[PDB]
Amino acid sequence: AMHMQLKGKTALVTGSTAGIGKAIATSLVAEGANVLINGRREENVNETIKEIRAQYPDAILQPVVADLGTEQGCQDVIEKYPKVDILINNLGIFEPVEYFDIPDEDWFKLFEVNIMSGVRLTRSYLKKMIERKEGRVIFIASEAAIMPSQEMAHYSATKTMQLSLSRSLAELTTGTNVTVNTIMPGSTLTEGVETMLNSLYPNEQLTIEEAEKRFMKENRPTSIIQRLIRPEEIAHLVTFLSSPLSSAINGSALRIDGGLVRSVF
Template sequence: MHINLSGKTALVTGSTAGIGHAIARGLAAAGAEVVVNGRSQAKVDAAQAAIDKAVPGAKLCGVAADVSTAEGCAALLVAIPRVDILINNAGIFEPKGFFDIPDADWQRFFDVNVMSGVRLSRGYMPGMLERNWGRIVFIASESALMIPKEMIHYGMTKTAQLSVSRGLAEMTRGTAVTVNAVMPGPTMSEGVQTFVADLAKQNGQSEAEAAANFVKQHRPGSLIQRFATVEEIANMVVYVSSKEASATNGAALRAEGGLLQTIA
């Protein structure tokens, strides 16, 4: 199967690093014109340069906007009024005990992880429905179904993303627009690399040992018994963004290494 997204414009929020950057690179390699987004112009410019180097001839533009705010989303919609593919990837995580999570953190996580996708979907989806083609993908997590006790606030936002995604999919009935969610498991993004490096220092281990021990101790149900790469997650997202994925709609697609011990 050859995925060709030529002629399509894709916006990937939070695409200056990690999974979002890999998704942007994958969509560009498939021929899409990709809008790179981050909070600072310097990071957006650096991400564009990295993708351009990895994908010679890539069609790219960048918009610096903080999508955790209504103002940032509005600015992005003004700068890029139409997209064919919207990847709601912007997100944050932080291990913190439930009794230590203040109200401000609950609100911050909800604004970044949930409301960014709500606002941008509200802005872009009507045009997709009018044109009768579009793809919206929410980057959720296995934590949406297996709520981690060490970051309940994060798990709450990922469950909310599944609800929003499925609800929006119901609005596409009879059209060529699809809305889906992808659920990565533990993935070795830059943020996780920093987390693993800190664990390694705390426990006097190498980073490889710390990563392996984290999966064994905290995600023992993993069938692949390792962190996924950002490219492995991006592959799923590029597929579900494609014309070839036209029969996949309203789904919560797993890329979590077999952590979830259910068949549905």
């Protein structure tokens, strides 16, 4: 009674070369959606598509090599891929830099990359979805959008902003079956984190599992779950939201942070 009726639907997953974006893509094609994988580097895109052909040899994949952080990257894609039934705004970059040190241009970069990507894309895909009363748009933000991270003012700002953008969009869907919602993942075990855990805690013969554990206890004491979230975990929800089974959720920001944010919300 709980089918994800998303076979035959084309989903775009921006910056899905690795991490969450990769997890989300895999899960979605696993439910027979025609996933359009986007990444800046042509190598990274192909290499990802291979990891996937390997898992679902009967699958419809499409490499969308482009830079969605650039104005010209985006316009190419609305040209080359006019129809998109499910849009996941996963593209988002970051770099830790104490606040007084963030150069000015960096604020302009993180905004163009983490927001305009979403604005630019939806300016066409949502319009299109609205005319046909059908589809999803989901933003991948982070628990930072509510609890700003101490060494990423700007990133934290971009996340917080996404929420706004997300809600304003959700309200353009009045009457239809199109939902625009945002999810907020907590600390996930991406691949940069993966190896970050190797070098961290030296001098203490530690296993990488035991390592996650002390790292959480150490730098992320408010986590109830007490471990990184595996991409798959985020992917489950994203998929759920992608399905027409989630038609009652529109204009929401759902926290998927294993407890991080101490708030009754």
